[PDB]
Subunit: 272 residues, 4 copies
């Protein structure tokens, strides 16, 4: 089969298309990268008909040496990935010393990876370390209700985590480490990539106020489902707040009992 029918190209199409249908990825909003093994891509080598283009990295990462990824392109729309995966996605392989990468497949007509790729790489590095190599996905999208909440809730990790845990029972179990929140920062900068990667050490979800969310996970579905869980809770919260707020909710005691039953250690600071 053609690489377009591969599990990982189909996976990238599914995730980007689902996020598009959720209303989280207007225009080129959002970006998605997936760490692969050589063994995933090697069978499809005869599908690679052009010369690998080289792009240097300003900050090398030796931890990622020789590692292939499939990634969304700069200025590309999640809506279009299903229509032309080769135009909108690329497979890249970081070189031997992590000083740059080669584009191996896709990103046709001189397209390049998302301008956020260096920031994705830094977060991949921190998640590899934090999860002993199990995490493989970084997903950014403009999740609508989470965005709306950033204007009305204290932009504070403990406050925000507690509300999201209250907003759907599964949340504490899905993200016991809570949701990290940064100050508003200029997107595309080194600073925002650094700050995100730091919080990725402590959380699988990071919020960018007035902008969107960053998630990490071992697979596309687990990462998408993580974001979707947080966004569903946020959707419930927006309804409840719009109705004048909570008359009742999940208590700290109930949340602790929940953690205990499911063998997770919830972020203590959100349990007042």
């Amino acid at each position: 089969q053609n690489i377009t029918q591969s599990w990982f190209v189909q996976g990238m199409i599914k995730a980007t298309t689902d996020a598009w249908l959720k209303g989280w990825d207007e225009r080129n909003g959002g970006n998605l990268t997936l760490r692969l093994d050589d063994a995933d891509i090697a069978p499809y080598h005869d599908n690679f008909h052009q010369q690998p283009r080289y792009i240097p990295l300003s900050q090398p990462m030796p931890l990622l040496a020789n590692t292939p990824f499939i990634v969304t392109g700069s200025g590309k729309f999640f809506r279009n990935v299903q229509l032309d995966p080769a135009a909108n996605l690329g497979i890249v392989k970081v070189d031997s010393d992590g000083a740059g990468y080669h584009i191996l497949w896709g990103l046709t007509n001189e397209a390049v990876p998302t301008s956020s790729l260096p920031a994705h790489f830094l977060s991949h590095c921190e998640r590899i370390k934090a999860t002993n190599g199990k995490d493989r996905v970084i997903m950014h999208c403009h999740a609508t209700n989470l965005i709306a909440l950033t204007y009305v809730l204290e932009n504070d990790t403990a406050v925000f985590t507690r509300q999201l845990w209250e907003g759907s029972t599964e949340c504490l179990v899905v993200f016991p480490d809570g949701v990290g929140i940064l100050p508003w920062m200029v997107p595309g900068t080194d600073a925002i990539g650094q700050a995100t990667a730091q919080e990725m050490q402590k959380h699988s979800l990071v919020l960018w106020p007035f902008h969107g969310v960053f998630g990490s996970g071992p697979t596309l579905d687990e990462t998408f489902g993580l974001i979707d869980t947080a966004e569903k809770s946020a959707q419930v919260l927006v309804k409840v707040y719009s109705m004048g707020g909570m008359g009742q909710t999940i208590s700290a005691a109930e949340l602790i009992a929940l953690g205990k039953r499911f063998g997770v250690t919830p972020l203590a600071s959100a349990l007042a």
Copy 2:
């Protein structure tokens, strides 16, 4: 034809897919079980290529002895059922004494039924008794507006039923027995399964505050439609409450007249 094209596998795909598109089943949220007859499955026996795996039940149910079911898997996403029904669904058959069940088809790669299966079984038992064997479906989903309402309405069966009946004219006719509401409880426990099954004696719909809904019915479509009716009313209610509340509504007298016309006996406690 392959069992994937059977009415019941297609039915499970339709229900889980529709619920996914409704936004009720983020991640692995939700679960669905359907009681079958041997005669439904027997024609497809040559599609069963592996050895039935046995799983014991902590609480036996002799009422279900020898009974086959098709069920959603643990940790499986409703979104994916249409893509790979064999990975995400299983057909199980409870053994001769109801002390356990065999997995006959599906749940590939060592998957197991939803961890809520024992609780589904207990509710199936109570609905069989309550409806003289006509009910065959238990459906749990994270119906968004119903969830939101649990934070703002008294979590009380009579209050909640009356509002839902007011929220769409058909509601009293579709669920004259009203909607049972439990206290918040730790999901997955024996306690929540027991309490749900008790309320299933009196209602075809049970709410879990800050979590979701459980419904029972004779067919997938009737059960889905039951939940969808309640959820549509809840959606209307959320809009009305967000606009500052009801200026006018369906009265108790109008609700009683409605019951009389359609030959149903509405839950008296919701008719003040």
Copy 3:
């Protein structure tokens, strides 16, 4: 071709499916009937493989003598029409004296037309008279925002029409005769069918508080678009009201100028 591929069966599938996707037709909510000519159906006669079943009408309508219709079935779900049009739709032909009708095609497994068919017929009669035979469609659905508005706006034709005209500029041009509003009434009764048909003399749209909408038009698309226009305005209004109400809006003067430009005569009572 099979009658399933006919313009009118495809049209019924499109309309019911679109309304389902809009969230207007949970369960069996909604019903749709389309007046045909003999010439539409005659080519497909060899597709009619069973004996026409006769159903008498309590109130005859001689105006409809010998007239064929395609109709949605009782207890049938709009969601399922696309999956099995023959199970969920029927073609009926009223007999020579309008005292009853024969089912000619569809409504398989002893299904019957919507229990609202007599009420549809009465409204068809009044619309034929009001439009000199141009109207051919009666559509009922549970349009969500229109429903929500019935709890918060005076249930009064002039008030409701003015708000809907304000809620989207096209509204006055699409429904210059405004939207008739009934008191809440027990659905399925002779009384509600009579009252609806009376208002159908003056308006192409009729609201049933706490229930839904009835629309009439010359084609499926014009009738659907009429309802969709009103429902879109209602959706805008719900947002605006939820934000605390109008700071500015379309004035009576602007509405009159609009009417004049498009050569329509707007309901004077809504123009204060």
Copy 4:
């Protein structure tokens, strides 16, 4: 291949269908025109089986002499474009002196272009001048949240632009020239077409209070994405306002830093 499979007919189908699914184009609401080159259409000439019909223009535009466009039809529904592109779209070519145009393909059964075509032409002219011929698309739709905001925000370009920039971080970067707002005007008039074209000199987005939006861009996707970006911000804003308003937001300083980083010159009047 048939012209229906051409990039531009497929593009028109995608854009109108996506806008339909967004809920922005009830009934015949909305219209879309795309400026082509002769070279785009010339290969498909054997698909043009009828005689070009001539329609004069009241206001000639010599700037558009000999220029082909593909356009949506008058009274046509965006929903139907995918079902029958030839019925719902047309290819037109303005004549040698810009005094009228010929219909070359489509608009079957005596259909004509959107009655807004002259106004589209005037805006095309101004955008050609403003962008040195790079803009090729004018898109009008009834974007729901933007509409709702026009009732609650000062209908003032600087106020509205600032809120939309605050409502999603990308907005300042996507539309640094802000969003022009007209007074309410009677649609279809010369006056509204003139006023829109004037604002098109200064902005790529123009709002019509209580009605919808007009956008311009070099391609269908960039123009659609421009509107979708503004509409997504508006959706966030509606949620935030419905929750009681902003507790925090993007500051003028942060917005200026954003502009600087991305090399754009933001509308100074929105930066208090």
